[PDB]
Amino acid sequence: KLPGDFGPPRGEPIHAVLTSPPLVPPPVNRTYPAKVIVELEVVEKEMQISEGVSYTFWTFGGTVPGSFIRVRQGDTVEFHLKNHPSSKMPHNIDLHGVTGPGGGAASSFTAPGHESQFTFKALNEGIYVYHCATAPVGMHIANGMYGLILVEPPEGLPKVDHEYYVMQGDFYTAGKYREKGLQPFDMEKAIDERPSYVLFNGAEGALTGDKALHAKVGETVRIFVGNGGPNLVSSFHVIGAIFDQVRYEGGTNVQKNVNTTLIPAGGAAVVKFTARVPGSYVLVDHSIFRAFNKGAMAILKIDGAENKLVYSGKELDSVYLGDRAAPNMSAVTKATQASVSGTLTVQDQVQAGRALFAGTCSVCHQGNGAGLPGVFPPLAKSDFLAADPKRAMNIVLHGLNGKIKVNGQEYDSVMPPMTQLNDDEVANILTYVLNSWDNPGGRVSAEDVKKVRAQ
Amino acid sequence: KLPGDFGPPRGEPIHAVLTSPPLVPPPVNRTYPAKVIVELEVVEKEMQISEGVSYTFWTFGGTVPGSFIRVRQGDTVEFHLKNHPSSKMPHNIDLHGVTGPGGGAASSFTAPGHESQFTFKALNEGIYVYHCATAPVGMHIANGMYGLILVEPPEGLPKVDHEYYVMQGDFYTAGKYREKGLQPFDMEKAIDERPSYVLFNGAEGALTGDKALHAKVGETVRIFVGNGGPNLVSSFHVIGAIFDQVRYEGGTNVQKNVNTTLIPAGGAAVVKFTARVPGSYVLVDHSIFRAFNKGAMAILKIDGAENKLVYSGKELDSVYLGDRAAPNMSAVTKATQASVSGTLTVQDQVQAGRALFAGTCSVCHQGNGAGLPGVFPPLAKSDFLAADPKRAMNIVLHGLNGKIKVNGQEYDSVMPPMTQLNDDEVANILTYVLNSWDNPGGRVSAEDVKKVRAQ
Amino acid sequence: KLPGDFGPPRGEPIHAVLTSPPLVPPPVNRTYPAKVIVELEVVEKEMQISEGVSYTFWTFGGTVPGSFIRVRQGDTVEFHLKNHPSSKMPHNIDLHGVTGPGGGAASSFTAPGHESQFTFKALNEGIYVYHCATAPVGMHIANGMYGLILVEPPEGLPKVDHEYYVMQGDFYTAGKYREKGLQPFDMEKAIDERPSYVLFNGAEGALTGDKALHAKVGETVRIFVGNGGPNLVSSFHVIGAIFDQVRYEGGTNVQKNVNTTLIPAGGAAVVKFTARVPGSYVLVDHSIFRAFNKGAMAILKIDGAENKLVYSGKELDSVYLGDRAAPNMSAVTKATQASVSGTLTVQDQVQAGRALFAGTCSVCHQGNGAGLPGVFPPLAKSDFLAADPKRAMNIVLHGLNGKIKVNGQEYDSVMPPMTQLNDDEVANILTYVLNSWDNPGGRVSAEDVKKVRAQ
Ligand code: HEM
Ligand code: HEM
Ligand code: HEM
Ligand SMILES: [Cu+2]
Ligand SMILES: [Cu+2]
Ligand SMILES: [Cu+2]
Ligand SMILES: [Cu+2]
Ligand SMILES: [Cu+2]
Ligand SMILES: [Cu+2]
């Protein structure tokens, strides 16, 4: 016999209510199999992959990941795929929860302005990736065409306080990380599996700061975690806690009490978390340069009473989270726009640089620029800075070592190069520093930095 | 006590019958431990890694992966390794099912024209990789020196309708993907873990089209799946279905009802599949650029009656499978040979281009070149094509965007660049198009494309 | 209720005794929860990452991996982090066994010459990675800032004969593998996940030869295996045996009888091994170029009686282990130092070349240089070598093929290029060969090879 053998659809046809990340539809709360009509529309559109960095995403339902679909094992699903008239490419779908060739792909081929449909029975409970299946498949997936479908067990999942939807992806831009402007897809980086960004939910900061996920001490949180790839395998981890359980796809196996778990490319898991003490818990890909250098950082923020018997310490700060500690980095978006418009002010630069200074510079120089006498020199009221701003550009790009004197005190240490910062970033950071802490003001431009970098 | 403690070998010595991929030897069907004599011969030889692309493989038994070995837990295995006189390198073996230093390596060192032997007891049931263990080990493995040995449990595995043998590997050629000719091994790409091909069973198309695996609706299929590496980890997946179970090596754990499973480099699993509806099921590495851009695609084709209650849709086609939808791409091999011989005809090019057009171009332009009026312009009887074939070369290499007029209708869309196509491929595709659909004929040469690419 | 609910700390405060790799502290052997005081000091210092290759490591307790910490589930841990005054960077810690934001990171921020402390309850049994959490986090981890903490179950782990501590990491030097000198950290390679070295316990050869782990036939060995990353996932494997069991972190799941297991970046496992026959067992990352080309090789050497019924063969040798078969390669360190000092003698070169010849050249030419008549030409008393030492430099760098005559016999084979050998390595190998086996003596310098390579 086939699995999911719960008889013909009964009751009324149900129009599925889909949700945008990071939200999940309500439990189906149903004891009979139904005919479920799913309507999903492909939209190609520019969105911000990072502040001041645009990208042409290809999306299921206007978001990356695409809309979440929730059905019950044994349901008959009538799947309608529309391709918005504004699209340039044809699209289709492969849902991993489908039993049949291509997971739906041949019968869902949809040209711009058209609609397709096919029907399948959801034989297998589990959490499943869906994605586009149109040649060149890797390009479509790299552009954002993936999401999750949950096929519930007949009795439903256990009740929890919160359910969230998080999906990792690797992205391939022609430009480097945080290089501003509209960035094309880069096929060469994609084939080589060399992403410029590794993200949760389609953008840097999508789930940090004021966009964090929330829960309270004592509550349970279920996260449906996908890995759209196209190429990477996530060493998926929660900083500061453990997963009560991890279950992949529709697997019978459930792992309990683990911290780091590998999510295949194209894979998905259901994880459960119990909040014990307050603070920010960081979901990461623990291939650490992804998390800390390419954007693969999301936050679950827990509110409630401290418990000093369990953890005596403090909330996370910019030392660990860097420039994502703060609510947002909107000033960077604004400064980038002003640069494009030819209206960039000193204050635009100052506010962008303030945002970027956090972690990146403050770890050593402090958030107030005071440093630590004899160990980390001050940027506040710094004679050394004021004496030569071109030197300061070179220091950021190329580092500094050896004995120096700053504000009457000797330092003999090492500031590593920070060459991966883009010209605008260096310029804005230095303009912030120059306009703070009784420093002499003025500004550094992106062009100034470009010239120094080329020397 | 040691595992596999079933007493001394009894009965008669057994000469193992080894099989070539994708076939498996019969179940041992035996209730006593035996002395099993295994004879395996290393052969170095050129084979086609892709159409018109030769590679010097180093093989156990003339194939990649090497011959399949099947024994019973508790057997005494007398292992004979021969190195064919034509070999240039020495070789040896490490079988993961051996208990002892090197898995056999020191006692199996075999110079060209020599033979070695050693004896081991198969203490541990499971599916195991074997591979060469000769410095430089990575080179030997990269050249194809890996296979599987099954050590059955004493009672045998459960009966199934079909057993097949599939093994992934990563390959490192000096030339790029689909660049024709005899391709040397590339040590630099290998050290960097940057393969040019990622394959099942040693070649593009080894298990697609007319070389697909087969079964019928209702049947069970067991696949012994290896990952020879040397370097990659497979996000192993079956498009359009689920694995009933997955068991790694000799592990006690068995996962049931999963879709995507990570196979370590050097690892192996036994997977089981039950055929429910007809069509082509695609085994892939779901690190998707491997599957769709480097060759990591194999097919299990299921014949039988459709079941519209389970899946209403169609068989896979070139939109998803690309140029591997068709039975084979023999015309590409023939055209490449003709180029070498200096006898390349227009028709040779046309037939090669026909094969390559599928998916690559047809996804948008259609298999009949009609496109979709106002959305995808026609290649059939195309005034725009005819007006300027050099422009058409540039369009394939570099893409096209902006408003154009084709056959009296305006288009305002984007054709992405296709720069990864090789000169011969562009030339053959365009020659096919020019000689189809009332287009003006003539031909485009590889040299013509080379010149355009260099501009 | 919280896990680890064993009541308030009792008895006396315990000062934890930490161990350096590859050793482990004794079992806690305690039936009550305690207050455990842990004191760990960060030290930045140069050490040898390979012979003659220095690197500035950042360490917890002076070693890579850092000191091992062993506590009991339910303990209250008062964690003190000191940063040695000689440090240039600030540091902190994230222990995966902590419940709380950052795993301790915000409350452990410690400038050079300072100390910090925080308290946590160890709620969860398991083996856990700890690492630095200071921006830029990837740099700190890449420089060696990781280790393991074991949180025992209340009843303790089962008794074994030996417990060892092994931790993989990926490292990023500006220079290539085995290029001599003090090598800076390379941020570009790190972001691209392109390590120059992949190591166990912080150095090539850290656990090979005279630094191998030991046990006897019949004994059980537990290894606490970490993967500090920062970036790689280990296809962790024991050559020549099986793991009796593998348990990740504090997971409920235990896998039994497996050979190859994936350890996530930031992950950790407890593996168990039962020694059955004598010899050297190789722990590797089975992404094979890491193991055999980047240093990811460690040894568990088992002493005791052979059992020919289980394995008839020989101990490992340089064919498989290469230049790590021997007790050590101290001669390479000495020759490199002599080069720096301007005192390099012929004999210094000869002894370094002797060490490097093993495997690298001996696999084909034999340890005595005799080759195999008509198959592999001799280096012993070689007329061809003597006739043209510049040609011999080119042969090592660029390979050799075609018909040649050596000592009166024709060869018609292929010696692959060995271009990844550094100039000093080629020079020392050839000087060894020239000064052995009745060859004419003299020497080849690194500068000689540099010139040939540049041709
Ligand atoms: C972040 C991009 C950042 C800025 C900006 C910055 C500036 C800076 C200047 C201008 C100097 C010169 C001396 C002065 O105090 O005016 C300087 C010197 C040092 N820095 Fe710095 N610095 C930034 C980042 C960092 C980081 C992240 C660290 C710590 C890892 C750091 C440290 C130092 C040190 C030490 C010096 C002195 C070097 C010496 O030769 O002794 N900086 N920095
Ligand atoms: C496959 C290699 C392929 C070929 C060949 C090809 C040819 C081609 C030509 C010659 C034109 C010019 C106009 C004409 O119809 O003669 C052209 C234009 C467009 N193409 Fe194309 N094309 C190939 C592949 C693809 C693929 C895979 C797509 C869809 C993703 C595609 C689409 C288009 C579009 C759109 C245009 C018009 C661009 C515009 O400026 O409006 N082509 N193609
Ligand atoms: C290790 C770095 C190494 C050295 C040194 C080396 C030297 C060497 C020389 C000098 C020759 C010339 C002929 C002679 O015998 O004097 C030579 C030729 C061949 N080699 Fe070699 N060789 C080194 C390594 C290796 C390895 C690892 C192999 C086997 C894979 C190998 C093989 C050969 C072969 C074969 C030849 C002859 C080539 C031919 O044209 O027939 N060498 N080697
Ligand atoms: Cu699409
Ligand atoms: Cu998929
Ligand atoms: Cu070999
Ligand atoms: Cu192996
Ligand atoms: Cu640190
Ligand atoms: Cu961590």
Q: Distance (Å, rounded) from C-alpha A152 to C-alpha A155? A: 8
Radius of gyration of chain B (CA): 25
CA A18 remoteness from chain centre: 21
Q: Which of A256, A257, A359 sits opposite C135 (nearest CB)?
A: A359
Q: Where in B157-250 does DSSP place strands (E)?
A: 162-171, 181-183, 197-200, 213-216, 220-229, 234-239, 243-248
Ligand 1 pocket check for A364: Cβ under 6 Å: yes
Cα angle B206, B207, B211; round to 5: 95
Length of chain C (residues): 455
With 0-12 CB in 10 A as exposed, 13-18 as middle and 19+ as buried, what is A181? Answer: middle
Cα angle A27, A100, A224; round to 5: 30
Do the chains contact at B101 and C359, CB–CB below 8 Å? no
C-alpha pair distances (Å), A290 with each of A140, A154, A181, C454 = 22, 38, 22, 37
Q: Distance (Å, rounded) from C-alpha A320 to C-alpha A342? A: 35
Residue with tokens 């849709």: B313
Q: Sign of torsion, CA B363 B369 B370 B376?
A: positive
CB-based contact (8 Å) between B303 and chain C?
Answer: no
| Ligand 2 site-directed mutation target among B356, B364, B426, most atoms within 8 Å of CB | B364
Residue with tokens 């348990």: C247
Q: Distance (Å, rounded) from C-alpha A428 to C-alpha C116? A: 33
Do the chains contact at B120 and C420, CB–CB below 8 Å? no
Q: What is the dihedral of CA A342, A348, A350, A356, to 10 degrees?
A: -90
Phi, psi of B199 (to 5 degrees): -135, 155
C-alpha pair distances (Å), A107 with each of A349, B298, B303, C25, C242 = 52, 21, 19, 62, 47
With 0-12 CB in 10 A as exposed, 13-18 as middle and 19+ as buried, what is B403? Answer: exposed
User: Cα distance from A437 to chain C (closest Cα, Å)?
Assistant: 22
Cβ contact B154:B73 at 8 Å: yes
- The bound ligand whose nearest atom lies closest to the alpha carbon of B60 is 6
Give chain A's end-to-end CA distance (angstroms, integer). Answer: 73
Q: Which of B88, B106, B135 sits opposite C359 (nearest CB)?
A: B135
Name the amino acid, one letter, at B36: V
C-alpha pair distances (Å), C117 with each of B229, C61, C81 = 46, 16, 6
Name the amino acid, one letter, at C310: V
Cα angle C378, C380, C382; round to 5: 70
SS3 labels along chain C: CCCCCCCCCCCCCEECCCECCCCCCCCCCCCCCCEEEEEEEEEEEEEEEECCEEEEEEEECCCCCCCEEEEECCCEEEEEEEECCCCCCCECCEECCCCCHHHHCHHHCECCCCEEEEEEECCCCEEEEEECCCCCHHHHHHCCCEEEEEEECCCCCCCCCEEEEEEEEEECECCCCCCCEEECECHHHHHCCCCCEEEECCCCCCCCHHHCEEEECCCEEEEEEEEEECCCCEEEEEECCCEEEEEECCCCCCEEEECEEEECCCCEEEEEEECCCCEEEEEEECCHHHHHHCCCEEEEEEECCCCCCCECCCCCCHHHHHHHCCCCCHHHHHHHHHHHHCCCCHHHHHHHHHHHHCCCCHHHHCCCCCCECCCECCCCCCHHHHHCHHHHHHHHHHCEEEEEEECCEEEEEEECCCCCCCHHHHHHHHHHHHCCCCCCCCCCCHHHHHHHHHC
Q: Which of B310, B313, B376 sits opposite A106 (nearest CB)?
A: B313
Residue with tokens 């950082």: A297
Q: Sign of torsion, CA C181 C184 C187 C190?
A: positive
Count of alpha carbons within 13 Å of A300, Cβ hemisphere only? 32
Which 3 state secondary structure label does DSSP give B352?
helix
CB-based contact (8 Å) between C209 and chain B?
Answer: no
| Ligand 1 site-directed mutation target among A400, A414, A421, most atoms within 8 Å of CB | A400
With 0-12 CB in 10 A as exposed, 13-18 as middle and 19+ as buried, what is A2? Answer: middle
- The bound ligand whose nearest atom lies closest to the alpha carbon of B370 is 2
Nearest to A275 by CA among A164, A120, A112, A359: A164
How many C-beta atoms surround the C-beta of residue A37 within 10 A?
Answer: 16
C-alpha pair distances (Å), A272 with each of A5, A221, A259, C406 = 29, 6, 11, 70
Q: Distance (Å, rounded) from C-alpha C77 to C-alpha C128? A: 15
Name the amino acid, one letter, at A192: D
Q: Distance (Å, rounded) from C-alpha B89 to C-alpha C115? A: 59
- Reading the block at residue B122, the tokens are 């198969």
Q: Distance (Å, rounded) from C-alpha C301 to C-alpha C278? A: 8
Cβ contact C186:C174 at 8 Å: yes
Q: Distance (Å, rounded) from C-alpha A295 to C-alpha A202? A: 10
Cβ contact A342:C157 at 8 Å: no
Cβ contact A256:B263 at 8 Å: no
- Reading the block at residue A140, the tokens are 């479509």
The sheet with strand B146-152 has its strands ordered as B69-72, B146-152, B126-131, B94-95
CA C417 remoteness from chain centre: 26
Eight-state DSSP code of residue B64: S
Name the amino acid, one letter, at C148: L
How many C-beta atoms surround the C-beta of residue B303 within 10 A?
Answer: 12
Q: Where in B279-318 does DSSP place strands (E)?
A: 279-285, 297-303
Phi, psi of A218 (to 5 degrees): 95, -15
Cβ contact B318:B325 at 8 Å: yes
Task: State in Å: Cα B358 to ligand 9 middle.
Answer: 46
Cβ contact C13:C133 at 8 Å: no
Nearest to B282 by CA among A250, A92, A100, A90: A100
B84: annotated binding-site residue? no
With 0-12 CB in 10 A as exposed, 13-18 as middle and 19+ as buried, what is A11? Answer: exposed
Dmax (CA) for chain C in angstroms is 84
Name every residue whose Cβ is closer than 8 Å to that of residue C142 and which is 6 or more positions away in sequence: C169, C170, C171, C172, C185, C190, C230
SS3 labels along B377-406: CCCCCCHHHHHCHHHHHHHHHHCEEEEEEE
Q: Distance (Å, rounded) from C-alpha C96 to C-alpha A156? A: 32
Contacting chains of C (3 CB pairs or more, <8 Å) are A, B
Give the residue range(s) of CATH 2.60.40.420 domains in chain A. Answer: 14-155, 164-324
Nearest to A288 by CA among C227, C168, C266, C103: C266
The hierarchical CATH code for the domain B164-324 is 2.60.40.420
C120: which chain A residues are within 8 Å (Cβ-Cβ)?
Answer: 310-313
Ligand 2 pocket check for B18: Cβ under 6 Å: no
Phi, psi of A363 (to 5 degrees): -55, -40
Name every residue whose Cβ is closer than 8 Å to that of residue C346 and which is 6 or more positions away in sequence: C431, C435, C441, C443
Residue with tokens 């873990």: B193
Which 3 state secondary structure label does DSSP give B328?
coil
- Reading the block at residue B130, the tokens are 């074997």
CATH class of the domain defined by B14-155: mainly beta
- Reading the block at residue A369, the tokens are 């620029």
Radius of gyration of chain C (CA): 25
Strands B297-303 and C146-152: what pairing?
unpaired
Length of chain B (residues): 455
Cβ contact C379:C437 at 8 Å: yes
CATH architecture, range C330-454: Orthogonal Bundle (1.10)
- Reading the block at residue A52, the tokens are 């001041």
Cα angle A365, A370, A375; round to 5: 60
SS3 labels along C29-90: CCCCCCEEEEEEEEEEEEEEEECCEEEEEEEECCCCCCCEEEEECCCEEEEEEEECCCCCCC
Q: Distance (Å, rounded) from C-alpha C361 to C-alpha B383? A: 64
Residue with tokens 């340890």: C367
- The bound ligand whose nearest atom lies closest to the alpha carbon of C383 is 3
- Reading the block at residue C100, the tokens are 């709380």
C52 backbone φψ class: left, alpha, beta (φ>0; ψ -120 to 50): left
Name every residue whose Cβ is closer than 8 Å to that of residue C400 and which is 6 or more positions away in sequence: C414, C415
Q: Distance (Å, rounded) from C-alpha B34 to C-alpha C162? A: 35
Name the amino acid, one letter, at C429: I
How many C-beta atoms surround the C-beta of residue B132 within 10 A?
Answer: 27
| Ligand 3 site-directed mutation target among C400, C403, C431, C438, most atoms within 8 Å of CB | C400
- Reading the block at residue B172, the tokens are 């490192």
A282: which chain C residues are within 8 Å (Cβ-Cβ)?
Answer: 102
Cβ contact B101:C212 at 8 Å: no
Do the chains contact at C105 and A319, CB–CB below 8 Å? yes
Cβ contact A321:A212 at 8 Å: no
Nearest to B298 by CA among B286, B281, B315: B281
Q: Distance (Å, rounded) from C-alpha B341 to C-alpha B353? A: 19
- Reading the block at residue A228, the tokens are 């759209």
CB-based contact (8 Å) between C287 and chain B?
Answer: yes
Eight-state DSSP code of residue B86: T
- Reading the block at residue B132, the tokens are 């060469």
Cα angle A432, A434, A435; round to 5: 65
Nearest to C433 by CA among C372, C342, C371, C375: C371
Helix (H) and strand (E) counts in chain B: 11, 23
Nearest to B127 by CA among B145, B148, B156, B109: B148
Name every residue whose Cβ is closer than 8 Å to that of residue B155 and which is 6 or more positions away in sequence: none
- Reading the block at residue C343, the tokens are 């005192």
Q: Distance (Å, rounded) from C-alpha B450 to C-alpha B442? A: 18
- Reading the block at residue A189, the tokens are 């980086």
Q: Distance (Å, rounded) from C-alpha A277 to C-alpha C250? A: 20
SS3 labels along chain A: CCCCCCCCCCCCCEECCCECCCCCCCCCCCCCCCEEEEEEEEEEEEEEEECCEEEEEEEECCCCCCCEEEEECCCEEEEEEEECCCCCCCECCEECCCCCHHHHCHHHCECCCCEEEEEEECCCCEEEEEECCCCCHHHHHHCCCEEEEEEECCCCCCCCCEEEEEEEEEECECCCCCCCEEECECHHHHHCCCCCEEEECCCCCCCCHHHCEEEECCCEEEEEEEEEECCCCEEEEEECCCEEEEEECCCCCCEEEECEEEECCCCEEEEEEECCCCEEEEEEECCHHHHHHCCCEEEEEEECCCCCCCECCCCCCHHHHHHHCCCCCHHHHHHHHHHHHCCCCHHHHHHHHHHHHCCCCHHHHCCCCCCECCCECCCCCCHHHHHCHHHHHHHHHHCEEEEEEECCEEEEEEECCCCCCCHHHHHHHHHHHHCCCCCCCCCCCHHHHHHHHHC
Nearest to B329 by CA among B196, B165, B195, B203: B203
Length of chain A (residues): 455
- Reading the block at residue B363, the tokens are 């996804």
Phi, psi of A189 (to 5 degrees): -65, -40
Resolution (A): 1.1
Q: Give the best residue of A193, A256, A288 to mutate against chain C (max C CB count within 10 A).
A: A288
Q: Distance (Å, rounded) from C-alpha A115 to C-alpha C418? A: 58
With 0-12 CB in 10 A as exposed, 13-18 as middle and 19+ as buried, what is A13? Answer: exposed
Eight-state DSSP code of residue B154: T
Phi, psi of A441 (to 5 degrees): 75, -160
- Reading the block at residue A271, the tokens are 């994880």
Q: Distance (Å, rounded) from C-alpha B262 to C-alpha C261? A: 10
Q: In the beta sheet, which residues pair with residue B117?
A: B80
CATH class of the domain defined by B332-454: mainly alpha
Q: Distance (Å, rounded) from C-alpha A206 to C-alpha A50? A: 9
How many C-beta atoms surround the C-beta of residue C357 within 10 A?
Answer: 22
Nearest to B6 by CA among B125, B112, B167: B125
CB-based contact (8 Å) between A233 and chain B?
Answer: yes
